[model samples]
Target: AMESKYKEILLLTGLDNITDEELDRFKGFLSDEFNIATGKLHTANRIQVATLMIQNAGAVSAVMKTIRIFQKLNYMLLAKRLQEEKEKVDKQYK
Candidate 1:
C-alpha cells in the first residue's frame, strides 16, 4: 500500500521525467499478474528512474554528485523531523 502510494506520488510529482509508456510498463510489472511484492516493484521502479535520469537527462558525474548531495540533505531533514516528532511524543508521554 505504501509502495502504491509512492508510485502515485511519483506520477503526480513528475520529478523523474518518465514517459507515459514507461509508466505503463512499470505499472504492468507491478500489477498483481506479476506476482512480485510492492516493495520489490518499487525498488525496480526507482532503478528505472535512476537509469532514465542518467541516460535521458544527461546525468553526468557532476549531476549525480549534486543529486547525492540533495539525497544527503533529504536524509538530514528527515532525521531532524523525526527527532522533533520523537521529542514531541516523549514530552506528551512524560
Candidate 2:
C-alpha cells in the first residue's frame, strides 16, 4: 500500500541533482546502513534501491530510513519534502 508513496519519496530526493560523487556516497550509505550488498547498490537506480529496501525491510520502514539517509547526505530540503509527502500519504491511507 505504501509502496508507491515510498517510491515517490525516494524519487523526490532529486537523484538528478546529485553529483556522481554524491550518488556514490548515497549508494555507500544504503549499503552500510541497510546491510545491502555494495555490488547490488552499485548498479541500482533510485527505484531499484527503493524496491530493494522494501524487500529487505518493509515499505514504511524503507521510507523513513530513506529520509534519514537524505538528512545525513545534507539533502535537508529533499528530506523535508519527503517527510511532508509521507505525512500526506499517511493521512490518505490511515
Candidate 3:
C-alpha cells in the first residue's frame, strides 16, 4: 500500500540522508508549512516524524510535502532522489 511506499521513500530519500541540523530545519519547515506541532517535532526522531507527516497529510501529500520541503531547504539531490523514488513506486503500483 501507499503507506509502505511513503515509508520507504521517506526513509531512503527524505530524512535518512540529512544531517542533524538539516533535520531540525526540516522539522521547522514542516511545522510552518504543514502545521505539525513544534514540540512533538523537537522530540521526535526521523521515523516518527515521517509517521506523523503521513498521519497528518495522508500518504500522497506526505510524499509531495517532503519533496517540497527538500527543495525549500536547497537539498536538490535529495529532492530529486525522492522524486525518482516516487516515480519508481508509482510505476510499480500501476
Top lDDT: which candidate number? 3
Cα deviation at 68, candidate 3, in Å, is 0.1
Per-candidate Cα lDDT values, in order, are 0.39, 0.76, 0.87
Candidate 1 has a TM-score of 0.24
In candidate 1, where is summed lDDT lowest over 10 consecutive residues?
59-68
Residue range 1-94, candidate 1, lDDT tens digits: 3333333233333324445555444444432332334454454555454343334333332133322333443434433433443344346446
lDDT assessment of candidate 3: 0.87
Residue 64 Cα positional deviation in candidate 1, in Å, after optimal superposition: 30
For residues 9-48, write the lDDT of model 3, one tens digit per residue: 9876788999999999998888756767788889788889
By summed lDDT, the worst window of 10 consecutive residues in model 3 runs over 31-40
Q: Which stretches of model 1 miss by more than 4 angstroms?
A: 1-74
TM-score of 3: 0.92
- Each model's RMSD to truth, in Å? 14.1, 2.0, 1.1
For each candidate in turn, the TM-score is 0.24, 0.81, 0.92
Error of 3 at 47 (Å): 0.9
Candidate number with the higher lDDT (2 or 3): 3
